[PDB]
């Protein structure tokens, strides 16, 4: 491209429990529409399976944020339309439901950083 391309991170809203599968669907739709060029690195704050271990106490809460996924890609009419075609997808998260405002790359790292955070010392 005459001008250096810029990659931006976008948030994807999906139903809880299927957030992991939703990401897999992107690879299929993107691979079929050859949109991989736009998608750079998708993030998955949820695991396809769950661990037997759980909160030490029921009163305790979870800092995990299911239903939210981060994906790096360029905002365009193709990808955008491709995202809507993705099944089990509520929509995008940004200023409006038709154009997700881009966020700094460091901000995207903070979101995933929260998932790594654990309640080693519950109070």
Curated annotation (Swiss-Prot):
GO biological process annotation, one example: transcription elongation-coupled chromatin remodeling
Asked if the keyword Transcription regulation belongs to this entry, the reply reads yes
Is Transcription regulation a UniProt keyword of this protein? Answer: yes
Q: Which GO terms describe its cellular component?
A: cytosol; transcription elongation factor complex
* Record keywords, A-Z: Ribosome biogenesis, Transcription, Transcription antitermination, Transcription regulation, Transcription termination
Q: Where is the signal peptide?
A: none
Q: How does it assemble?
A: Monomer. Interacts with the transcription termination factor Rho and with RNAP. One NusG monomer forms a stable complex with a Rho hexamer. Binds directly, but weakly, to the core enzyme of RNAP. Also interacts with RpsJ (NusE). The rRNA transcription and antitermination complex (rrnTAC) consists of RNAP, NusA, NusB, NusE (rpsJ), NusG, SubB, ribosomal protein S4, DNA and precursor rRNA; S4 is more flexible than other subunits.
Free-text domain note: The N-terminal domain interacts with RNAP and the C-terminal domain binds either to Rho or to RpsJ (NusE). These domains are separated by a flexible linker.
- Briefly state the protein's biological role: Part of the processive rRNA transcription and antitermination complex (rrnTAC). The complex forms an RNA-chaperone ring around the RNA exit tunnel of RNA polymerase (RNAP). It supports rapid transcription and antitermination of rRNA operons, cotranscriptional rRNA folding, and annealing of distal rRNA regions to allow correct ribosome biogenesis. Participates in transcription elongation, termination and antitermination. In the absence of Rho, increases the rate of transcription elongation by the RNAP, probably by partially suppressing pausing.
- Family designation: Belongs to the NusG family.
Under what name is this protein listed? Transcription termination/antitermination protein NusG
Q: Lineage of the native species?
A: Bacteria, Pseudomonadati, Pseudomonadota, Gammaproteobacteria, Enterobacterales
């Amino acid at each position: 491209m005459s001008e250096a391309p810029k990659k931006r991170w976008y948030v994807v809203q999906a139903f809880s429990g299927f957030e992991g599968r939703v990401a897999t669907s992107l690879r299929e739709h993107i691979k079929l529409h050859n949109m991989e060029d736009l998608f750079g690195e998708v993030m998955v704050p949820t695991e396809e399976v769950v661990e037997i271990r759980g909160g030490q106490r029921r009163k305790s809460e979870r800092k995990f944020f299911p239903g939210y996924v981060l994906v790096q890609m360029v905002m365009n009419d193709a990808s955008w339309h491709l995202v809507r075609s993705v099944p089990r997808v509520m929509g995008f998260i940004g200023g409006t439901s038709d154009r997700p405002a881009p966020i700094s790359d460091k901000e995207v790292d903070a979101i995933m950083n929260r998932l790594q955070q654990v309640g080693d010392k519950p109070r």
